[PDB]
Write a protein that binds this ligand. Structure first.
Ligand code: HEM
Ligand SMILES: COc1cc(/C=C/C(=O)O)ccc1O
Ligand SMILES: COc1cc(/C=C/C(=O)O)ccc1O
Ligand SMILES: [C-]#N
Ligand SMILES: [Ca+2]
Ligand SMILES: [Ca+2]
Length: 305
């Protein structure tokens, strides 16, 4: 029963405080809008959007931050702390960490040039973190299209539009050499690069990510507009210039009969992509929320009250 008006009486400036925090951080860290969107996705795919990802380690449960999809990868946690502190100062004990992160993701998208919309609100915060579930549920860059579809369905997103539109988050941000080395030098034990990678881009990427090189070096997900939220991600796919395997599979998989037309539709029209992104974002944001009196409004996003 979420609603976009949930804080219109109790904390009417929450989205403004969130926005100003991100505007400021972007001057020194141009990557932070992308990092924050990713945090929200990794929240919603593990027991729902319940801020379980923000919890640090305790002696009775491990943090999701040591999951394969989060360790030495997920980032931005201090920025979420700063905006939470600012909102707590303005509207004490009102806005859940789960909702804060949902607003932060939306405002990140708008600030980077994407659509503007009011997210549904009224989620509450978990009482535990789920490390094993994060290892089970977050999809990996080496997944096939059937594995990606199974990963989305497992959490409740059955639609191929959900998968294709939400993969558009890779219109900005960075990726480590580590996750493309197989594609550049030895794909699926063939001793060859992935044939679905454009051979001119292949040269470029080998230059950035040499064999025996720094596996933690960073590369841009979108070679056209690395920091702008736009539909250029889909244009790249159509040219075999998706960066990671899971990107290019949306256009090139044997199982892509349903996803190819969505990829083209989104490359062809900014409005069609933005409308679908908003619709899929709100469906992801509605995965198994705690509401009403279930869970908490956490005061410090890293610890249960
Ligand atoms: C469909 C399956 C997906 C997989 C396999 C995947 C995989 C990845 C991987 C491997 C990275 C780079 C991590 C690093 O190098 O440490 C990345 C980054 C990122 N992903 Fe995804 N992702 C997927 C879906 C999504 C979705 C649904 C969104 C959001 C709507 C998202 C938003 C992003 C962003 C914005 C970044 C850049 C983060 C920054 O630069 O800090 N991804 N993803
Ligand atoms: C209390 O802090 C803030 C309040 C606002 C209000 C904005 C508006 O009413 O448009 C904006 C930024 C802030 O940091
Ligand atoms: C770093 O990004 C990710 C890595 C994995 C999995 C890695 C593995 O199984 O080794 C899954 C999701 C991610 O977002
Ligand atoms: C994306 N993780
Ligand atoms: Ca969660
Ligand atoms: Ca872009």
């Amino acid at each position: 029963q979420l609603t976009p008006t949930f804080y219109d009486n109790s904390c009417p400036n929450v989205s403004n405080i969130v926005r100003d925090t991100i505007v400021n951080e972007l001057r020194s860290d141009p990557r932070i809008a992308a990092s924050i969107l990713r945090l929200h996705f990794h929240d919603c795919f593990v027991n729902g959007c319940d801020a379980s990802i923000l919890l640090d380690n305790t002696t009775s449960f491990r943090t999701e931050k040591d999951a394969f999809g989060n360790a030495n990868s997920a980032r931005g946690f201090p920025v979420i702390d700063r905006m939470k502190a600012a909102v707590e100062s303005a509207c004490p004990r009102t806005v859940s960490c789960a909702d804060l992160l949902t607003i932060a993701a939306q405002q990140s998208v708008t600030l980077a040039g994407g659509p503007s919309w009011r997210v549904p609100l009224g989620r509450r915060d978990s009482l535990q973190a789920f490390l094993d579930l994060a290892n089970a549920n977050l999809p990996a860059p080496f997944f096939t299209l059937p594995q990606l579809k199974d990963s989305f369905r497992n959490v409740g997103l059955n639609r191929s539009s959900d998968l294709v539109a939400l993969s558009g988050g890779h219109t900005f941000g960075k990726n480590q050499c580590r996750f493309i080395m197989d594609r550049l030098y030895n794909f699926s034990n063939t001793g060859l690069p992935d044939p679905t990678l454009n051979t001119t881009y292949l040269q470029t990427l080998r230059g950035l990510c040499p064999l025996n090189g720094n596996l933690s070096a960073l590369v841009d997900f979108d070679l056209r507009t690395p920091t702008i939220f736009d539909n250029k991600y889909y244009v790249n796919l159509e040219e075999q210039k998706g960066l990671i395997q899971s990107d290019q599979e949306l256009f090139s998989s044997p199982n892509a009969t349903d996803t190819i037309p969505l990829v083209r539709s989104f490359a062809n029209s900014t409005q069609t992509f933005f409308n679908a992104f908003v619709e899929a974002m709100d469906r992801m944001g509605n995965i198994t929320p705690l509401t009403g009196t279930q869970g908490q409004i956490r005061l410090n996003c890293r610890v249960v009250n």
